[PDB]
Design a protein around this nucleic acid. Structure first.
Ligand code: MG
Ligand code: MG
Ligand code: MG
Ligand code: MG
Lengths: 218, 214
RNA sequence: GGAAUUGCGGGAAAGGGGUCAACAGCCGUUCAGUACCAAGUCUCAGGGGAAACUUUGAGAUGGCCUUGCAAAGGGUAUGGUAAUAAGCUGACGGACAUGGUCCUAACACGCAGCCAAGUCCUAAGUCAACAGAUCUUCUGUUGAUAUGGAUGCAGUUCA
């Protein structure tokens, strides 16, 4: 399937640097312009830079100009955004998006999945995962406590359990650390037969935790 | 620069209703306007470009039109999966600018939350903290009040809540509220209760447990 | 009496008819490929003309985003193609229910053709004013002037 595959974001200290990659698959980068759009957590879309399909005409937002540099590797069908001297204002989900060459009045047809850039002096911390134990439908879940930075993603039974699952938005706590809960409602008759394991991925800390959640006693 | 002013910043409409979102450009952008749908945590999805052209992968219930500097996205028969923030964009002059977004939510019958309470795990409690979680499952509308009481003492300042985004099939929300106590405070008290007020509930519903292995 | 009153493109209301629950149709900012590089504008060269202009060849520009316009902006052979540059073929992707699509089609719009008027260009020929004499005939400059042209949004009907 034709797509744009984004990587390279994550946690960086103020003044630090990050290089975002945007690999094109199934369309040609030379016949595309590549646009970088960022969205601060919970806010709107901001266009920050682009390189036209001639690869030479670039535009950068004033606050980003000099610090950010778009480049493209024709051989790898990949565009890059080098982001230097990063500051808290830059914290956001960064998207690369493309537009067909010459279609100057059009919008952006293919978009990368987004990468969170977090500019912070705070240290990475992987999550503690605790069971929300079940005690004819039963709710069970896991509490993912005290991690940094975002994101954490949760699946159940390695993606085999998706019906009835609710994974809540992370909450930033007074400690500076994030917490989130993932819950699933299952048939109570399955509690003694079906194993329920929540799979918590915290890629920012190189951690994956699987927690089996079972009835306790009270 | 060109400002794209999007009206309704938020709206709620029923399945089957025609939804109209408008974008006023601060100056002429000819027809260089695109509309995007963004689902929470996902990249924006192109719907309409050049003011009125439908992009592939978009149901034909979405259409766009222009009158001078005013642009309209119309969803002619809203469906449950259409909950999203919608953004207009102008590509007439640099910098490219987006509207501030219009949040669309699906109005459906009122549904009361099913409420569950979960005590802290013994492992977390031994580490010095008690997180008590109150789950409000599958309710509508989004507005719900959760009050925590420990030994009937009204709690304040020590809880946070998180709400899911609307379900794409049944248009309900779910909400978790977490009360955080020190191990010391948690072991001092017996009854932990979360009291939920919601339009679907004729009276506030309390779900509680008593601390202890029992 | 004779000439001419034209050739087309993309849409498309209403009624009818065919067809499709995903179509050998339709849509695409996807991929590859076939064919092709228009009009207009400008410059030079060959032919016509007093000139203005015209025709042919070559070049430049143009073309795309942009089917209200397209100056600005971007794109511009790594490009482009409606009616005078395939808007082509294959694949891939996509939309569709009192919906999609096709035929029939009022209708407006657009691309061209022919172009009345108008405008604009030119002034060979002619006329006028002044001047000049060569004795009844004259030439000079300055101006006007088309019957020469180019442009042309009117008109292109009825059946
Ligand atoms: Mg043509
Ligand atoms: Mg065209
Ligand atoms: Mg042609
Ligand atoms: Mg005519």
């Amino acid at each position: 399937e034709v797509q744009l595959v984004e990587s390279g974001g994550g946690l960086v200290q103020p003044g630090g640097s990050l290089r975002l990659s945007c690999a094109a698959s199934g369309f040609n980068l030379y016949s595309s312009s590549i646009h970088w759009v960022r969205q601060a957590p919970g806010k709107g879309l901001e266009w920050v830079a682009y390189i036209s399909s001639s690869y030479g005409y670039t535009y950068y937002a004033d606050s980003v100009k000099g610090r950010f540099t778009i480049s493209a590797d024709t051989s790898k069908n990949t565009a890059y955004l080098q982001m230097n001297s990063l500051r808290a204002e830059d914290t956001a989900v960064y998207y690369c998006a493309r537009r067909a060459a010459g279609m100057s009045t059009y919008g952006f047809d293919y978009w990368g999945q987004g990468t969170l850039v977090t500019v912070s002096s705070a240290s990475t911390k992987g999550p503690s995962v605790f069971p929300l134990a079940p005690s004819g439908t039963a709710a069970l879940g896991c509490l993912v406590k005290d991690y940094f930075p975002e994101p954490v993603t949760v699946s159940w039974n390695s993606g085999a359990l998706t019906s009835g699952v609710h994974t809540f938005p992370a909450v930033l706590q007074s400690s500076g650390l994030y917490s989130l809960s993932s819950v699933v409602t299952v048939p109570s008759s399955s509690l003694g037969t079906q194993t329920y394991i929540c799979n918590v991925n915290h890629k920012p800390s190189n951690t994956k935790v699987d927690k089996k959640v079972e009835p306790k006693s009270c | 620069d060109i400002q794209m002013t999007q009206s309704p910043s938020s709206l709620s409409a029923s399945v089957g209703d025609r939804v109209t979102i408008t974008c006023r450009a601060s100056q002429s952008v000819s027809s260089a306007v695109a509309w995007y749908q963004q689902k929470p945590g996902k990249a924006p999805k192109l719907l309409i470009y050049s003011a009125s052209s439908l992009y592939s992968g978009v149901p034909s219930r979405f259409s766009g039109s222009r009158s001078g500097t005013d642009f309209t996205l119309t969803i002619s028969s809203l469906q449950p999966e259409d909950f999203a923030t919608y953004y207009c964009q102008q590509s007439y002059s640099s910098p490219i600018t987006f509207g501030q977004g219009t949040k669309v939510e699906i109005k459906r019958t009122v549904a009361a939350p099913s409420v569950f309470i979960f005590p802290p795990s013994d492992e977390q409690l031994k580490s010095g903290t008690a997180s008590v979680v109150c789950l409000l499952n599958n309710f509508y509308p989004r507005e719900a009040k959760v009050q925590w009481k420990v030994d009937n003492a009204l709690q304040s300042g020590n809880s946070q809540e998180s709400v899911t985004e609307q379900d794409s099939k049944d248009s309900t929300y779910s909400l978790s509220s977490t009360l955080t106590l020190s191990k010391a405070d948690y072991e001092k008290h017996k009854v932990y209760a979360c009291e939920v007020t919601h339009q679907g509930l004729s009276s506030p519903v309390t779900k509680s447990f008593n601390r202890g292995e029992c």
